[PDB]
Amino acid sequence: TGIFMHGKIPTLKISLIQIFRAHLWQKIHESIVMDLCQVFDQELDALEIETVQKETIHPRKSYKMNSSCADILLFASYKWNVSRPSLLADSKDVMDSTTTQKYWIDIQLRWGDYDSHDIERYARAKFLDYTTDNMSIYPSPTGVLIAIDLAYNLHSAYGNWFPGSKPLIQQAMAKIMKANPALYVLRERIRKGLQLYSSEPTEPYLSSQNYGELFSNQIIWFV
Amino acid sequence: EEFNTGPLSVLTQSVKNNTQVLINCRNNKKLLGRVKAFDRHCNMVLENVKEMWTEVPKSGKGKKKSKPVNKDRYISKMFLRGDSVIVVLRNP
Amino acid sequence: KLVRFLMKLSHETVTIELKNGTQVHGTITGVDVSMNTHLKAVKMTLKNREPVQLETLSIRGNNIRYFILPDSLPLDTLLVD
Amino acid sequence: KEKDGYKPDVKIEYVDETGRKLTPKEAFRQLSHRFHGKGSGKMKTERRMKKLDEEALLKKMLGTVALLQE
């Protein structure tokens, strides 16, 4: 896991290990990558993308915190006019004077504590550290890095953008965070660990304007 | 191009959204269901169709005295050949 | 062309309702480009008649009102080009 | 950037081969099966399939009997 423990807190350590049992970190990473690749396949034609290549990731890449690699690679069939590195929420981005053919995409999961739960800053720092670094190998200098804070359920990306990419990734991240199975499983595990539950709406008492449903296929009883 | 502005736009706008269409067929069976695909002839392959038609009990008395009843049957996946289509209709 | 979806459907037990109301339940063997449907292990109920078992049938493609496919069909890998 | 300008209707949905909408729990079940490389047991597969056909039989559809017996 990519969770860092400052101090040996055995209670918290066992709780977290139980929460993340069965390679949940890697399962989440895999799920996110597949969802993004699927959405890209869906909007391929509209975004003028030749193909989506699932970069062959190293098995221990999900929690490889010190370095990184590329996860998805978009083959263009053309040359896109790309933008300067801007936040995923940066509604105004200036175009860089360069064009590319391969557009790579990296996913980084984090467990941010109170001090450092700023996903935007983390994404910026990691993108400009890994791209410039000697140990991190990327296919092209042009690409995007997307950081997801699990502990706070936050999302944001920083790298370059070509037309359509920014809105597409914005909505795709929205829907992924809303309905990813691995994320849902982690959320439910955390809820179980905290024994914190949500409540219910009683159910509308049958009124004269609601009795009409009594004669549907579902079998109903009056006591 | 003009695949999406012709009169088959009722079908290619209903297969994109996967909404249900009502089809009055030629033998006056009514097909309610979602278009999985269509073509030039409106050969619509459909999923989850309610086929609703009318009957009478056809002189069960012997004196030809009965009222028409609404019958329907469910079909899971069908390939409706599109000559028998009279009208396809997107839902309100 | 959607008929090309049907000729990918070799060896499926489908029923076919025709324009004469006759329901034909059998394993489809061949489709033309004009939907000329050749069937085997045929249980044909001509309507207003009792159903007849026949070993082979060949419906002309014009006279098909509709098909009825079973539950277990993977059409998302069948209607691709 | 001079964006294109449109509404991308993104839908993320998990479906079984038969085309039924998949609940997230069994979606992750299938994901984990494919991930580890080993599926469920024969008994569990049989139970699951019998449940599916039970749902189908129930959905595809004694007052007269009680009236006659009264």
Partner: peptide, 21 residues
Amino acid sequence: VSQKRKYRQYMNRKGGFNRPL
């Protein structure tokens, strides 16, 4: 329409450390 998700394998592969396609 929709298609069953195509996930990769990590454990008990007998293959190279890197992913297949």
